[PDB]
Amino acid sequence: MYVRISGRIRLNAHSLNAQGGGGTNYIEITKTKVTVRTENGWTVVEVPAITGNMLKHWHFVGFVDYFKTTPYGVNLTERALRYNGTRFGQGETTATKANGATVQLNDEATIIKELADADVHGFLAPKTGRRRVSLVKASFILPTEDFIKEVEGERLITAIKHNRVDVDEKGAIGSSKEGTAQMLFSREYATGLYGFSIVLDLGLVGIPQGLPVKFEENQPRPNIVIDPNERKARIESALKALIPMLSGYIGANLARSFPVFKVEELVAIASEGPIPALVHGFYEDYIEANRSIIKNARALGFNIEVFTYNVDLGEDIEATKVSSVEELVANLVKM
Amino acid sequence: MYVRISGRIRLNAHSLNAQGGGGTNYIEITKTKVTVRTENGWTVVEVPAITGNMLKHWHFVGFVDYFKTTPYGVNLTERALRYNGTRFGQGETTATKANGATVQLNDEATIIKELADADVHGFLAPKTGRRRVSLVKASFILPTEDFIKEVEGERLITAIKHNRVDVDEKGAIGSSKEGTAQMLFSREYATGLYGFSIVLDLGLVGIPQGLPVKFEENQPRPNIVIDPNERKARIESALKALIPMLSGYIGANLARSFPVFKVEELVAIASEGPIPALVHGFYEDYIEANRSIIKNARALGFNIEVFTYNVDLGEDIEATKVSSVEELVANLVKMV
Amino acid sequence: MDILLVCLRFPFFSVAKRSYQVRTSFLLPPPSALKGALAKGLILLKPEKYASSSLDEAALKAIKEIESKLVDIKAVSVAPLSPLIRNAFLLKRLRNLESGSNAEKSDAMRREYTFTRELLVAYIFKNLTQEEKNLYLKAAMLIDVIGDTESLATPVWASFVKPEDKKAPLAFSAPYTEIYSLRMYIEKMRVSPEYSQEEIFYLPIEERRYKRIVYYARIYPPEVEKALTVDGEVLGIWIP
Amino acid sequence: FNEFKTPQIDPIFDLYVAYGYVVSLIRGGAKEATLIPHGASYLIQTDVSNEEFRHGLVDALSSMLSLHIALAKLVSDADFSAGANINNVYWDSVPRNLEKLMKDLEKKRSVKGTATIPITLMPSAGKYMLKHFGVQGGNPIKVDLLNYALAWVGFHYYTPYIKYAKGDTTWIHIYQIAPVEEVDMISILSLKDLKMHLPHYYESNLDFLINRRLALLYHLLHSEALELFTEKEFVIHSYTLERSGNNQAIRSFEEEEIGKLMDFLWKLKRRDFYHAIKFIDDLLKKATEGALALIDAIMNERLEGFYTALKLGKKAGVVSSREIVAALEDIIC
Amino acid sequence: GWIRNIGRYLSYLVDDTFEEYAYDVVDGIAKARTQEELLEGVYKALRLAPKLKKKAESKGCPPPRIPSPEDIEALEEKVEQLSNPKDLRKLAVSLALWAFASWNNCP
Amino acid sequence: GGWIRNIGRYLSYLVDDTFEEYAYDVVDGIAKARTQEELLEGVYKALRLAPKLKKKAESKGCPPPRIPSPEDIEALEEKVEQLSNPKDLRKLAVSLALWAFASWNNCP
DNA sequence: GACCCAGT
DNA sequence: GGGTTGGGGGAAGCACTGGGTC
């Protein structure tokens, strides 16, 4: 419904956010800078960070994977199955579904009903406007400065060479004229302890933002312009899309790197209505600050349920001891 | 049909993944920095590691060997039989079939209908422009955290010099300018409680990315290009390609290193559907994590098939006590 | 005079200036982005008043209401308490919004951002009534995402403060229109968004290197009679 | 005191146009001048008349036309013609504007036309902007000739660039120093010495020019310019114009600082000079992938970088002089 | 600084004039972090004294000079109170850095 | 502190020349050991060759080697019992073996 | 929206 | 301990959707 997950992740030796390889041979991994407070001053370090676009793309990938399980897989665009993510264009008005059905762009009511991918991440149509805000938002995957405080150095960038062997008509090796594909390139993999934070907005699934409520009987109720039974199924299709994140399906080079992924600690809040995000998995004061933010939301009248994984988070909060992401989802799918 | 294998391996005495070049003496082993605790903060420690590229290449090598015995083995790339992983490199507009035929490069499905290599490890078509996502995803090979915590990283690398005996016909080895290509080179070998987390996605075999479904009467049906019996045989061959992974065919240099192996604790999950990946064995306290990843996921409505070895689990789920990986894949090929 | 001060500890920036290939970003968040982030919070929280056919007028009416409840054109100011640093990111920005060039036309653009550790946001009002004071207090929080849909911001707290004419040098941003006596630092800031004007603001950023790095330190402009104190660290606010 | 006004458009374009003001006032004298930084405005404070400003521009453009016509619709091989220019349409359009002022500035007439800025002087330019919905046609960023001519004069002389083609593809890396706290005629004129005219290396032996962060070291190595950065403060801004397979696009754009690199080279090349350049050139040419570990250790003071590069380079060929080893520990201690 | 008189011996096992080419000890000493492998790695380098003694005489140059024990204790007395990796690497990396020199004494 | 140099001087006479005695096995075993028990075994094996070297040096013209003082035996004995963890055991295992190779003026 | 271009 | 060899050559990103004009 309204779930905010965050925490710290320990993944190392992973090739994420490379520089392509159009002509550059040494494929150096992206390098970032972070500031950290020490000895009454601020210092920076050349440490890699992963953008959240990888996280959003993997959410899109997992959405269709968990959407094809239910018999409601008809309502899905063809481009979603090929991992396109273009969402129409400046002049594209018709839609390409799995069965080839045509969709007319007039309002979100006839779009979020016949199509499901266009609602989770939104779309745009400059010909007729009608822009849809992405319901799912990702965060940049960057290493915490606690790791820098305990390291403040070291290479932490594993540069390994990889070779692509090639054969001729009989097993010969060419240099520049025999028509060979022999190549010897480099790959840098990143290490360290990073942080993650994902927000989900399942309350707008099937409810247009322009008219969120019905408002014809003096009783504001959600304007579910789609069928409720399949709306509930769509809830889980996006809720389980974050399960592959907590398993290793992050970034690229999964066939050759497959990051060594295991979450050490996380905190989440689940609620029926809109709720603030707790903290990014970066700052050292990411526990007690959350201990504050909860009491900053309970006094406002929010029925927030806190789920904790490998964190005490004090004792007054009625948090639930979570041991993995899957039972968190299982405890969220009911509501 | 997605299957996840994850576990440990006492892989040692191996010069795998070596950084060296023709004009580069002292061929040395790959070293990957990792994050550990050592009863203190998340410190960083150096340790040798193995790349997932290698594992992917050796999975290709095993897959082609196990696909040779299949009656449909003729439907494979000729270069694949040559123990070469160059799937549609640069310099050619088409590949060569095993029988000597070629492959046409406009449609994605017609590439994999007569070829079982791009349908099992992906491909890239530079000149044409199209591409396919990979099937099998291999993880790096890293030792257990507690293993390097207890030994606090004492070298863990053994450098051995090797030479040859390239003596002339007369029976004398004199000068380099003499013509004796004979010399001293060093190889680095490593040990540790390594771990792997290989995953295979057999639900995408024979399914082109451009047109994965047909929906001719508006029904759930992925667009398969190959015969269902052919698809079953290819899936069985892919599953059988897992035995050489633990059978010592982890990496190259087997002619001179051939690392020692033993079946440690393993966990395999497969239920013929979208399945999350497992937890890597690099972390010492991962077993308890496996007691929470699939504990309630079974109650979600998935008929998760779990095969475990050298672990008692939480003695509450239907975890089959499989003997070795060959029985594990035998139990997987019988449900497809 | 009441000032609503909140804290946003978001690592990486989200705003991108008018640029192609590279995506230059502001050193401090633009007022237009903050206006949008606060306006979008009133729709999903109070949908019984924001009734619109589409998003185009939905944003316009919210911005009009925010400007109406505002003292002047100046929307909202920010205060950096951490050394800003200009990072470098390479993202995918597909170019397929023209009448042609098929459907899939995507290449890599360097969409780089800015990193900070601590930041304050000070909204200004004209002593509003109580019945909407609580509504705006609740709306100040729940700012999960700012700028684009790839970076998340996390609010910390929200409280009202009085100027009381305390002695403290200016710390938040101020427009460069009539302030000359206040090393001076002004850029295009775009306080007012457009939906189919451009004012110049003074930004408290200065580069100081001690022995290794330059970052962006504090310029400490001359003291302004208007200021607000919080958590011991008092900061100077410019009020017209 | 005149305080020539400088329009604010782009943080990088304004750097080029305002920082190029000095090359004209030097030709016209302008004693006791200064440049007050503003982050992006970078305003010049000089007590000089406006008349000599055009006398500076006419001499600067005479030098530009003399350089352009010497080499060879006519396309030269200079910085402003084909060196840093990645687009061929600007190979002849840009010089045409430069000579156009010869019909405007000589007889004391103000500019009336308005040209289109290419991407080389300002990377934020392009063809597809976003205003409210969708994109537009052409380049909406249109720059007046007055500010247009003031950018190339500062670009050719002051900011250096490195070009490495390798046949069809082409990599162009542009670096420039931007003052951030104070600056005077001593520093801005010294930065002019860093410019590499005709940096066309090609062949295959000189491949070390791969990556911008590695090309900057090679550019800096053979230029032992003024070392005032040990007491001053300056920032390096760099951008790339990749043309891999005749595909003009920018794929690398990072912000770094040059002061620590200044200090590193100043502390390195002090005990001896004959062997330091030989050592660094050998590691750059042979240890292509290893010099990245050396350059990365400079902006973060990484201890393992000072060893990994040497380890990877010694295996191929390294002189490994004695006096330079003691130079590293001077930074280390 | 008790470094110039010990780095030249470490350089004896990398230079081309002495073809034995043992980088394992240099790799071990370069990646020494906690308390012990720094003292263990330097043992391997200091052990291969005969090698150099015979190799210098095999060509004509005088035998190399073995470092004096007048300053070896400066490492043991410094590694004790510098237990943390904060400043221990600060000299451990320099120990391996001084191993990559020429010291042309065998023409 | 103080006894390390004295024991290293004794260990130097086993690897230096002008003695026709080269036994690296024991000095290798002392340093790169794994368990505390074999440390004293290696120390005994190194120390056993005291009388055979205390007499040949003067016959060859070299000054007699200085036998380590018995007080240092007390220190090396009393240092090892309280330190049983292998974390900081290898450092002392190699500290005394380091001084075996040095510039001691055995035969001036 | 169809045109443009380079040298060792 | 007393001599012979320290890499050897080959590869060390192709294609791929170029972005400006007019």
DSSP letter for each residue of chain C: --EEEEEE--SB-----S-SSS----SS--HHHHHHHHHHHHHHH-TTT---SSHHHHHHHHHHHHHHTSSSS--EEEEE-S--EE----EEEE---SS-S-S--EEEE----EE-S-EEEEEE-S---HHHHHHHHHHHS---B-SSTT-B--EEEEEEE--TT--EEB-S-EESSS-S-----EEE---S-------EEE---B---SSS----B---PPEES-EEEETTEEEE----
Question: Which residues lie closer than 8 Å to A310 by C-beta, 6 or more apart?
Answer: A264, A265, A266
CA F52 distance to own-chain centroid: 15
Question: Which residues lie closer than 8 Å to A302 by C-beta, 6 or more apart?
Answer: A271, A273, A275
Q: Do C14 and C129 meet the contact criterion of CB atoms below 8 Å apart?
A: no
Q: Do A233 and A75 meet the contact criterion of CB atoms below 8 Å apart?
A: no
For an interface test with E, which of F87, F103, F105 has the most E Cβ atoms less than 10 Å from its Cβ?
F103
Angle at A331 between CA A325 and CA B2, to 5 degrees: 50
E strand or H helix at A151: helix A145-151
Residue F43 CA to residue F39 CA, distance in Å, equals 6
Question: Which residues lie closer than 8 Å to B163 by C-beta, 6 or more apart?
Answer: B182, B183, B184, B185
Question: Which residues lie closer than 8 Å to F25 by C-beta, 6 or more apart?
Answer: none
Q: What is the SS3 assignment for chain F?
A: CCHHHHHHHHHHCCCCCCCCCCCHHHHHHHHCCCCHHHHHHHHHHHHCCCHHHHCHHHHCCCCCCCCCCHHHHHHHHHHHCCCCCCCCCHHHHHHHHHCCCCCCCCCC
Q: What is the largest CA-CA distance in chain E?
A: 45
Which chains have 3+ CB pairs within 8 A of B?
A, D, E
CB half-sphere exposure, C175, CA atoms < 13 A? 17
E strand or H helix at B57: helix B52-68
Q: What single string gives the DSSP state of each residue in B250-274?
A: TSS-TTTT--B--EEEEEEEE-SS-
Could you check: is the Cβ of residue D134 within 7 Å of any atom of nucleic acid strand G? no
Residue D95 CA to residue B129 CA, distance in Å, equals 38
Residues of B in contact with D315 (CB under 8 A): 24-26
Which candidate, C214, C215, C152, places its Cα nearest to that of C9? C152
Cα F25 to Cα F15, F18, F51: the distances in Å are 11, 19, 19
Residue B289 CA to residue B279 CA, distance in Å, equals 7
Cα A159 to Cα A14, A29, B33, B188, D312: the distances in Å are 11, 9, 11, 17, 12
Angle at D132 between CA D128 and CA D133, to 5 degrees: 65
Could you check: is the Cβ of residue D200 within 7 Å of any atom of nucleic acid strand G? yes
User: Across the interface, do C149 and A134 touch by the CB < 8 Å criterion?
Assistant: yes
The token pair at C58 is 């939905």
CA F87 distance to own-chain centroid: 22
Q: Do C145 and C155 meet the contact criterion of CB atoms below 8 Å apart?
A: no
* Angstrom distance, D175 CA to H12 C1': 26
Give the Cβ contact number of residue C178 at 10 Å: 6
Give the Cβ contact number of residue D313 at 10 Å: 26
Q: What single string gives the DSSP state of each residue in A105-136?
A: -S-THHHHTT-SHHHHS-EEETTTEEEE--SE
Chain H footprint bases within 7 A of protein beta carbons: 1-22
User: Across the interface, do E100 and D328 touch by the CB < 8 Å criterion?
Assistant: no
Which candidate, A141, A128, A91, A115, places its Cα nearest to that of A251? A141
Q: Do C19 and D124 meet the contact criterion of CB atoms below 8 Å apart?
A: yes
Could you check: is the Cβ of residue D88 within 7 Å of any atom of nucleic acid strand G? yes
Cα D21 to Cα A218, C130, D53: the distances in Å are 68, 56, 9
Closest amino acid to nucleotide G1 (CA–C1'): C100
Nearest nucleotide to D243 by CA–C1' distance? Answer: H18
The token pair at F64 is 């007699």
Question: Which residues lie closer than 8 Å to D103 by C-beta, 6 or more apart?
Answer: none
The token pair at B55 is 């594992």
Name which of E21, E24, E41 is nearest B25 (Cβ-Cβ).
Answer: E21
| Phi, psi (deg, nearest 5) at residue C203 | -115, 130
Residue A238 CA to residue A63 CA, distance in Å, equals 6
Residue A304 CA to residue A270 CA, distance in Å, equals 6
Give the Cβ contact number of residue B20 at 10 Å: 18
Give the Cβ contact number of residue B125 at 10 Å: 18
Residue C73 CA to residue C175 CA, distance in Å, equals 10
The experimental resolution of this structure, in angstroms, equals 3.9
The token pair at A118 is 């266009």
Q: Do C45 and C142 meet the contact criterion of CB atoms below 8 Å apart?
A: yes
* Angstrom distance, B165 CA to H5 C1': 10
Angle at A70 between CA A69 and CA A76, to 5 degrees: 90
Q: Is A173 exposed, middle or buried (0-12, 13-18, 19+ CB in 10 A)?
A: exposed
Residue in D closest to C22 by C-alpha: D124
Angle at C74 between CA C72 and CA C76, to 5 degrees: 120
Which DSSP category does E65 fall into? P
Which candidate, D256, D279, D287, D288, places its Cα nearest to that of D328? D279
Which DSSP category does A215 fall into? -
| Phi, psi (deg, nearest 5) at residue D158 | -95, -60
Q: Chain D within 8 Å of E98 (Cβ-Cβ)?
A: yes
CB pairs under 8 A between A and D: 59
User: Across the interface, do E66 and F97 touch by the CB < 8 Å criterion?
Assistant: no
Residue listed under structure tokens 């729709």:
C43
User: Across the interface, do D316 and B26 touch by the CB < 8 Å criterion?
Assistant: no
| Phi, psi (deg, nearest 5) at residue B66 | -75, -20
Which candidate, D250, D175, D161, D164, places its Cα nearest to that of D207? D164
Name which of D210, D247, D296 is nearest A46 (Cβ-Cβ).
Answer: D296
User: Across the interface, do D301 and C90 touch by the CB < 8 Å criterion?
Assistant: no
Q: Is F13 exposed, middle or buried (0-12, 13-18, 19+ CB in 10 A)?
A: buried
Closest amino acid to nucleotide G6 (CA–C1'): D168
Q: Which residues face D179 on adjacent strands?
A: D234
Residue B52 CA to residue B58 CA, distance in Å, equals 10
Residues of E in contact with D278 (CB under 8 A): none
The token pair at D68 is 């352009």
Residue in B closest to A244 by C-alpha: B276
Q: What single string gives the DSSP state of each residue in D254-277?
A: EEEESHHHHHHHHHHTTS-SHHHH
* Angstrom distance, E54 CA to H2 C1': 9
Elucidation technique:
cryo-EM
CB half-sphere exposure, A314, CA atoms < 13 A? 12
Question: Which residues lie closer than 8 Å to B27 by C-beta, 6 or more apart?
Answer: B15, B18, B19, B20, B185, B186, B187, B188
**Helix axes of A228-239 and A325-332: crossing angle, nearest 10 degrees:** 160
Residues of E in contact with B154 (CB under 8 A): 36-37, 40
Could you check: is the Cβ of residue D246 within 7 Å of any atom of nucleic acid strand G? yes
Q: Do B157 and B48 meet the contact criterion of CB atoms below 8 Å apart?
A: yes
Q: Do A195 and A280 meet the contact criterion of CB atoms below 8 Å apart?
A: yes
Residue E51 CA to residue F21 CA, distance in Å, equals 16
Nearest nucleotide to C102 by CA–C1' distance? Answer: H17
Could you check: is the Cβ of residue D32 within 7 Å of any atom of nucleic acid strand G? no
* Angstrom distance, D222 CA to H16 C1': 37
Q: Which residues face B2 on adjacent strands?
A: B201
Q: Do B208 and B109 meet the contact criterion of CB atoms below 8 Å apart?
A: yes
Residue B331 CA to residue B272 CA, distance in Å, equals 13
Q: Do B59 and B241 meet the contact criterion of CB atoms below 8 Å apart?
A: yes
The token pair at B198 is 């290989």
Closest amino acid to nucleotide H13 (CA–C1'): A25
The token pair at D157 is 């002389």
Q: Do A15 and C62 meet the contact criterion of CB atoms below 8 Å apart?
A: no
Q: Which residues face A260 on adjacent strands?
A: A12
Buried b or exposed e, range B202-229, using 16+ CB within 10 angstroms: bbbbbbbbebbbebeeeeeebbbbbeee
Which chains have 3+ CB pairs within 8 A of A?
B, C, D
Q: Do B282 and B50 meet the contact criterion of CB atoms below 8 Å apart?
A: no
Which DSSP category does D82 fall into? I
Nearest nucleotide to D141 by CA–C1' distance? Answer: H20
A223 phi-psi bin (left φ>0, alpha ψ -120 to 50, beta other): beta
Residues of A in contact with C52 (CB under 8 A): 210-211
What amino acid occupies position A321?
K
Q: How many residues can be counted in chain A?
A: 335
Distance from CA of D102 to the nearest CA of A (A): 41
Q: Do A153 and A191 meet the contact criterion of CB atoms below 8 Å apart?
A: no
Residue C164 CA to residue C156 CA, distance in Å, equals 24
CB half-sphere exposure, D182, CA atoms < 13 A? 7
CA C192 distance to own-chain centroid: 12
